[PDB]
Amino acid sequence: SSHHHHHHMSGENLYFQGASAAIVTDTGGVDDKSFNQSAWEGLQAWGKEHNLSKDNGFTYFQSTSEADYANNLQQAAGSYNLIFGVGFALNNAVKDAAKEHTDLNYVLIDDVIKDQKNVASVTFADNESGYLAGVAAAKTTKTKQVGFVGGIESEVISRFEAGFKAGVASVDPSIKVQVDYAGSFGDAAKGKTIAAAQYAAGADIVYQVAGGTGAGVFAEAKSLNESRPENEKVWVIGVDRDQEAEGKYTSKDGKESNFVLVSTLKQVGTTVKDISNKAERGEFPGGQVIVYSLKDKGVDLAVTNLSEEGKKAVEDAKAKILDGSVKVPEK
Ligand SMILES: O=c1ccn([C@@H]2O[C@H](CO)[C@@H](O)[C@H]2O)c(=O)[nH]1
Ligand SMILES: C[As](C)(=O)[O-]
Ligand code: NI
Ligand code: NI
């Protein structure tokens, strides 16, 4: 109302104290074209906004196995006071690191840690984006058979799968969805052999929800499409980032096309940047669970090469998810 007892602080004497933010990466690595890459692009963009550079305010520690998680988190505790665990698999290692370093702030992406004041948890309604990918897939299949390549069987990938199946069923319940899991988010060779088998069995669209394993699914679709006419091409649905640029190829009949139908978006980078800004301002949301869904555009579908009929069905499906008229299952 009033502030009679006040003192003027000159701008020459004022500063904002900065934070140092690091990501600890899951198996996919910062070149997975999807989940970990999104996180890394977000941290780089945060670093740029704060006039920082790699290993001078921000960096990444790549994990190659589960045993690496703890070592990477402990290494990050040396110079960083905001540390991101990028992947549900990092749950336990983040819990342990947050308990040993109560003075530092920790974020878990894709799962929830309870009753830890220095931990924030971020989840995405990947069922809702998956549903839209399913509607898109059902509106473009000619063979009436589509493929789903998961990374690791889990609550997280089951949301994608359950949403995708439900979305396909909402358009045409007669469509067959072949489901196979690679058992890794960093095994490209397994992605290629699963995609090869799913296409050979009559899938004309594969949705790859497997991080870096998905590079094999792109490689398989490129090989098939290179040795075929453009009108006989087979589709891939992108994940986490808009992957349209990865679907470019030249057909057998010399035509240049794109085999990316649509991409589910998961704004991991945007979350990294937004929470890093909250941490620097001393407003770190410790103990909170942050839920991103279709409503807040934390997940979305990039429509890319979908037919106008498909786009209308997507917009109708999206509107019904926001309305509450359609409840997308999580299992
Ligand atoms: O290293 C990785 C890569 C991907 N994912 C999961 O796989 C999904 C699809 O890439 C991502 O949204 C994320 O939930 C992981 O858990 N770890
Ligand atoms: C009326 As319907 C469930 O086929 O979109
Ligand atoms: Ni006032
Ligand atoms: Ni005074």
TrEMBL record:
Gene Ontology CC terms, in alphabetical order: plasma membrane
Residue stretches making up the ABC transporter substrate-binding protein PnrA-like domain: 22-330
Residues that coordinate or bind guanosine: D26, G28, N36, D110, F185, G211, D240, K266
A Pfam family the protein falls into: Bmp
Topology with respect to the bilayer: Lipid-anchor
Primary subcellular site in the record, as a coarse category: membrane
Keyword field: Cell membrane, Lipoprotein, Membrane, Signal
Location(s) in or outside the cell: Cell membrane
InterPro entries in the record: BMP_lipoprotein, Peripla_BP_I, PnrA-like
Binding site for adenosine: D26, T27, N36, D110, F185, G211, D240, K266
Residues that coordinate or bind cytidine: D26, D110, F185, G211, D240, K266
Family per similarity comment: Belongs to the BMP lipoprotein family.
Protein name in UniProt: Lipoprotein
Protein species of origin: Streptococcus pneumoniae serotype 4 (strain ATCC BAA-334 / TIGR4)
